[PDB]
Ligand binder design. Sequence first.
Ligand SMILES: [Mg+2]
Ligand SMILES: [Zn+2]
Ligand SMILES: [Zn+2]
Ligand SMILES: [Zn+2]
Lengths: 178, 171, 112, 557, 268, 97, 84, 107
Amino acid sequence: VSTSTFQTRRRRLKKVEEEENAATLQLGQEFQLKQINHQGEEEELIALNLSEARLVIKEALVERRRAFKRSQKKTREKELESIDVLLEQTTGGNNKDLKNTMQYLTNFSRFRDQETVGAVIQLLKSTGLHPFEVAQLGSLACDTADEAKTLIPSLNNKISDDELERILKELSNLETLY
Amino acid sequence: MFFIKDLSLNITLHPSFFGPRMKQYLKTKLLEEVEGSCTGKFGYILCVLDYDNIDIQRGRILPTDGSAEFNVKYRAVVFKPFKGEVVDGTVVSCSQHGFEVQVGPMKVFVTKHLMPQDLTFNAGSNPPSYQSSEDVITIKSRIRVKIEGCISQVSSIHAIGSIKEDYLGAI
Amino acid sequence: EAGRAALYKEVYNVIASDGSYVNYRHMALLVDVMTTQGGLTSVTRHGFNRSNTGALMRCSFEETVEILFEAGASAELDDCRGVSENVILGQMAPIGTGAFDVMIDEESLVKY
Amino acid sequence: GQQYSSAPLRTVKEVQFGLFSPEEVRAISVAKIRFPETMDETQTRAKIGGLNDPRLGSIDRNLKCQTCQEGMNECPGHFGHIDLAKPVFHVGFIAKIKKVCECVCMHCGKLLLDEHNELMRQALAIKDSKKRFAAIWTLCKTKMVCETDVPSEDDPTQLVSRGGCGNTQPTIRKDGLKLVGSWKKDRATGDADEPELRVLSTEEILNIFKHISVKDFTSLGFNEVFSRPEWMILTCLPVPPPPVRPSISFNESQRGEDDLTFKLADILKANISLETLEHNGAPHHAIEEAESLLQFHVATYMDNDIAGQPQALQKSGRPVKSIRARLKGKEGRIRGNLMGKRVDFSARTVISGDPNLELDQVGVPKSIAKTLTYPEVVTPYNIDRLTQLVRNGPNEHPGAKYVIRDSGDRIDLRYSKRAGDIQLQYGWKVERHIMDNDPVLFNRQPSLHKMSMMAHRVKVIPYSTFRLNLSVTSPYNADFDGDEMNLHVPQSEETRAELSQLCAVPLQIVSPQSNKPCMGIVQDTLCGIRKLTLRDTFIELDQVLNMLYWVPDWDGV
Amino acid sequence: RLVKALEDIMVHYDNTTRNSLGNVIQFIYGEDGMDAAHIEKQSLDTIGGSDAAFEKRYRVDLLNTDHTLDPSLLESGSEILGDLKLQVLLDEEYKQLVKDRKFLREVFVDGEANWPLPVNIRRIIQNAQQTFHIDHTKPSDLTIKDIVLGVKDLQENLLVLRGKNEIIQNAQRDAVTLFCCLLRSRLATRRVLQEYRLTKQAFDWVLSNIEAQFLRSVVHPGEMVGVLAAQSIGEPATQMTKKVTSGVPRLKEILNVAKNMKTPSLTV
Amino acid sequence: LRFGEMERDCMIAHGAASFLKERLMEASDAFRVHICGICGLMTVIAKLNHNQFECKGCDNKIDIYQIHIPYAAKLLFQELMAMNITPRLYTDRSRDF
Amino acid sequence: KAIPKDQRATTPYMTKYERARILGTRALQISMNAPVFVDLEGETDPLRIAMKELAEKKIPLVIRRYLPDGSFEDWSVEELIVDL
Amino acid sequence: IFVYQNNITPSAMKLVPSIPPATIETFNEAALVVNITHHELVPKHIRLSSDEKRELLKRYRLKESQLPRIQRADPVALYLGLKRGEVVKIIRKSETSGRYASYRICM
DNA sequence: AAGTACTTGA
RNA sequence: CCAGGA
DNA sequence: TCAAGTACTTTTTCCGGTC
Ligand SMILES: [Mg+2]
Ligand SMILES: [Zn+2]
Ligand SMILES: [Zn+2]
Ligand SMILES: [Zn+2]
C-alpha cells in the first residue's frame, strides 16, 4: 500500500494527457499552485530554498526527539556531525536518502540562521513570482539579472532587470558568512 | 523546488496491537513505510513533519479478518526533480562517458557530450578528471547542472543534465 | 390508493380462505411494492425485474444475458447497494449485521 | 493458498458496464491468435505460438504462465485478440443496431428528427436513458427522409435549414443476422411500386455509426466513453484465456478441448478463408459467402440458441455450447455458481427424533463430527487443550485433522512424521473436530422459511442419523419417514456469533410470520399431556419421585 | 418471484423501509414501526358494548354522590367529592375515551375488538397483582392526578421515531395512535381502582413495564423485512389444497396482475 | 452440499451478513485478482514476487488494487468480456445518493 | 457527511445485529490475541470474554450507523443501551 | 375546467395547452356523476405546497426519485388537478397504528 | 400458458 | 437423459 | 388508422445408473 494526496480527480477510463514537466512552470498535477490541506482549505504550493528546507527538517527531527524521549518515560562541518547524530536518534537509519539530503543541505545552504531565512522569505515573497522561482532565487546564487533569468528561465518577463538586480544585491548581503 | 506536501497512508493494524501503544505503533509504522520512500508522483518522501500532530482518525474494522484499517493523514518534505531545473551538486563518479552529480537524495549524470568541447577526459589522474583550458572537474568538485530529463526508477529518480549552456559548470 | 386497498383485500382473502394467518405487515409490504411506482407493477420478469435496480441484481432472475447485454450497450452503473450484487461480489452485504460499520476508538481504548 | 501481494486491497464499490473499443481489445491483448491449431508444435506436445498460449494463460499445471509468472492457482488467464478480416454484428446487438439505423440517416449519420420537432424535443427531454431511446425510436422510425430545411420555431412559411442531406431512408427488416433495406424511391412521383432492394453491409452501418454525433448518440442510449454505437459491430475479437475454456486432459497424450476452443478455431478458419479470398483474386460472391459464414460463427459463439434455427451443431449432432448458454438461469453462472454455490464444511444424513435431546441441540453422528472441522487459533486460553486434541489426532473422537502454521503451510496430522512431537505456537490454527456445544446451521430443504435454517448446539452421538428434538420438527417441516437434513459449520468466531446470537432455535420460537409460536408440544407428549391432566389421574409416591427427579431444574422440594 | 421482488427491502436507521435505490416503500415498517414477533392479539375494550355499559365502566363524576369513586376504592375518596378542579381532569379523561371510541369505530367498521398490538397490558396487570400481592379489600394510595397524569406522561415516552421536527414528531404521534387508545382504555381511573385495585407502587411498576416492553417491541434497523414478507407469504402458499377462483391459481392471477382474470365479479 | 438460492434467502432474512459471506467465499469459491484503477478490468500482469504490477494498454504500473471475489465471478467477468461486454470494477464511488 | 453528536436521532438502544456483530468482532479479536479490557474471571472462550467486556461496557468500539443518503451517526458501545 | 357530455373533437383538443401560464382541464360529465373520492377505499389526499414539499424531502433526506408516485392521469390526481412535481399526503386508517401517513409525487 | 413486441390488412 | 428418494 | 395475427420469449423446491 502506497501514499495518496488531497488531489481527488476521477480519471474514468480516459487515460492521458500526462503533458511534460518543464520550468515553463508546468510542474505535475501534484505540484500545482492551488493545493488543498487536510482541513480542505485551498492553500498555495510550499516550495523551499535549500536552507529554508535545512531548517524545516532539522526542526521536525528536533521536535520528534522530544516526543521519543517523552514516550520513553513510562560551524557547518560542526553542523554535519551534530545533524548526523540527530539522524541516528530519530530516523530509521535505513533512510540513507535523508542522511545525504541533510549533508547536501548543510553544505549548500546560503542562509545559516532562522532570522536570515526570515528576511530572504519576506524580500522574495512580495515579487508575486511563483513559489518555484521564489525558491530557485533563494537557492541559486546569481549576480547578473541575466545569470538569474538564464538559470530561472520562467522569470523572463515577470520582473524588471533592475528590480531583479536590486533583489540579487540584497540577497548577497544576507548570505551568512560561513 | 523541495516541497512540503500533505499526504495520507492507509495502514492495516493486526488486533494484537489494539493496546494503548496503538497510536505510537501507527505513527511508527507510518514512518517506516513513508520515510525514505521514493515515488514518481511525489518524488523522494524525505522527512515526516509535525510528529506530535499526525492524524490517525478512527480505524474501520475489516470484516472477515480482525484487523482495523486507518487512513493516516500526514504532512512531509519532498524532493521532486524536474527537467529545466538548475541545480547545484557535488561530483561523485567520473568516467570516459561523463560524471554523476549528487543533488540531495538523487544523482544527475552529465554526458561527455553534454559539456563544452574544451572540457576533455583525463584517465591519467587519481581520481579520473575532466580538464578544460582553465577548469578541472573531479570527484570532489562542485557543479551547477541544468536537468535535461528524469527517469522514475523504482526506489529512486535519476536524471541527465548539461553544463554546456551559459552560467553552468564548475562553481 | 384504492388499488392498494383492493390488492391487499384480495391477497388477504387467498390466505385466510385456506384458514391461514399471515401478519398484516407482510401482505402490506408486497401490496405496497407493487403499488409505489404509480400503478400495478407485477411480480414477474416484466414488472419488478424491469425497474431501475442494478443490472447484476436484475440479471439474477429471468433475463440474465439480455439484461447484461443492455447493461453494456447503455453503460449502466451498478451502485452495488443490492444484496444480490454483494453475493456476486463475495462481499458482506448491507444486510442486518452489515447495515453499519465498526470502528476502534483510540480515545476509549486508552481510557480502559 | 494464494501468495502475498503488495497491491492495496479494496472492495468493488461500482460496476461500470460498457462495450469494448477494438483498440482496447488490441491493447489488453497479450497475443494474436493466428492459427486454429490448439497446440502440438507440429505434433510435438506443447502449446502453439498461435492458439491457446501464443503468450496467454497456461496448461501443464506444472510449467508457469508466460506473461505473468505465477501459474495455475493464482494466474487468471490473459486475454488475446483476433483481427477480423471484415466487420461483423454482435448477435446480442442485432436489434439495437437495427433500431439505431431506423433513427439515424443511412448516409450523413444525423438524427432523422431534432429540436425543431415538438414531439421530439419532448421525448429528447426524457431523463431515463432507456425510456428516451425508446421514445426517440417510435418517432424516428416513421421518418423516411433526411430533411435539409424544416419549418421555423414560429412560422411554417419561412423554413429554417437544419443539417443537410436530402436522401431517402430505407425500410429495414431483418433476414436472420442480415439487415436489408427497401428505399421508398420517386420515379414519376409514384415508385415504389417496385423499390431498391439491397442488404446493408456491416461496413456501411459501421461507417454511419462512426459519423453519428456525440450529442446525437448520447441522446440515444450510448455513452461517449464506455459505449459508442460503433462498438456494437466487431472488428477486433477478444480471445478468452484457457481458464474460461479449459481442456479435459484425460490420460497423458489425449486433448479434450472445450467447445469454446473448437468454436474459436471455426471463427479463425472462417476468417482466414475470407482474408485470403479478398487479398487474392476476389470472386466477389465467394467473398460475401465466406463473410456470412464468419458472421455466423462469431454469432453462434456468443449465442447458439437463435430464432433462425441452424443450431451450429458439433460433429456428434450435439449443439455447441454458447457463452449465453453458460450464464442462462439455474445451473450456470449467475444462478447456479453465484447466487448458490456447492460448499465445504457441509454434511448430510437421515434425520430421526429424540425425546432426550434439548430443543436447541442436534445429535451429530461421531463420523460426521470426525470429518467436519473448526479452525481454532492457538491462544494462551486454549493452548493446552488444543495440544491434546492434536495429540489425540484424526481418528480419536475429540481430536484434530490439521495444524496451520504462521508460514501458511498446512500440517496433515494423518501423515506428518511430526504429528506426535508437534509443538504449537500462539497464532497458529488447529483445525479440530466439531465438538459438543459448537453452534451449527441445521437445515431442511426446501427452505421457504427463515426457520428452515436454524442454529443448534452440537451433541456428538453414536449411530448414523442426525437426531433432533421433536418440537423443532414443525419449523423445518420434517418427519422420520426417510427425510435427510443439511448441516453447515461456521469457521470464524464472528460467524459462530451470528448463528448463536441471531438464528439459534430458542430465538426462533415466537415467529413474525403470524406473530405466534412456531414450535409446540407434539404427538406422544401432546397425547400424554391430556391423559396426565384429567381429574381422574392420580400418581403414587414412587412414580412422583421419578417424575420429579426427571425435571433437570427441580428445586428438590 | 416474491423473494426476488422483495430481497433488497430493509428497515434503515430512520425507521423507513427502502430498497437498493433508497426509494421509500413504507414510511415506517408495517405502518406501526413494530417487529411482528413482539405483537399479540389484544382486546380494545372501548370499541364495543352499549353506550350505557361503557359509561358504567369508564365514567367518574366526583360531583355526583352516586357516580364518585367510593372511599373504599382509594384513601382520598372522602376528600375527593365535589373537587371541581379534579373533575376538570376526569372530564378530559372521559372526553378522550369517548373520542377514542368513535375513532376506533371508524377504523374497525365491523366493531372487531381483538387486534394484534405490542405490549400485553392484560398480563402486566396480572403480574402486578401477584408481584405486589394486591389486597382486593383495602383502598388504594393513588391520587386521581397519579393515574390521569401518569398515563398522559407514559404516552410521551412510547418512542418509535426520534427526530426533532414537526414532520417526524407528527409521524411519531401517528404510529403510536392505536396503541394509546388501548392504553387509555386499560388505564382509565375507574378501571385502575375498581377493577385492578392497584396500589401506587403497583401502578408505577405497570407504567415502567409498558414503557420497557413497548421500546423492546420496535423493529431493529437492519431487519431484512423484504425477504421476511416474501417467505411469510411463500411458505403458507406451499400448504394450499358464489364459486370464485381461489387459492394457488388465484394467488398466481394476483401476482401476475393478470389482465384476463377467471372469475370477475362485482359486489353491489 | 449445495448452499443454494433458497438458503441464501434465509441467511438474508436472519441478517447473517458475515455468515453468508463466509458460505459463499471462504467455504467455497473465493479467489484473489488484481484489477486496474483506470479501466476496472482484470488486465493486471501481477508478477507478485518481483513486485511488478503493469496494466499495459493503460501504461499503468502504479494505480493497481487487489480484490477478493468468488472465482465464478472472475469467470463470469472473463465470460462477459469474451462476449465484448466490459464489467469495469471500481474500488471508489462517483455517484453519491 | 457525519452527523454531529448533538444532532444524532437513531435509537439510543443497541440493535440485535449491532450486538451480534460487536460480540462477533470482539470474540474474533480476543481470539487473535488482542488485548482484553476486563478481568477474565477464569474465562477462556473468546465469546464469553466478549460478553463480559460488553457487560461492563469496556469494549472500545464505535458503530458507524449509515443513513440511506450516505450520512452517518457514530455511537459508542459504552453509550448504547443493551435491553436485548 | 370543461365539462363535456360525449366528446371533444381533436381539433378543439389542440387548443388546450395553447394559452399558458393558465391551465385547461377536460372532464367527461359521465365520470363525475359519482364522486370517487367519497368511496370506502379512497383515502384523504392533501396537496403539498412548494415549501411543504421542500420540507418533506429535507425531513426524510429524499430525492424526488425516492418518493412513491401518483400517476398524472390518476382519478384522484385528476380530481385535485395535480401537476407534475406536485406532492400528495395520503392519510389512511391503519389496523396496525390507527392512522398512517404516506406521500405520493405526481407523474 | 401467458405474456410483450411487432406486424398486417380494413 | 433415465430411474428414484423427502 | 386499429383489430387481429404473427414471432418469440419465459418458468417449473432440495437429494444413483449406464452412456
Ligand atoms: Mg417425510
Ligand atoms: Zn498469467
Ligand atoms: Zn442525411
Ligand atoms: Zn487498465
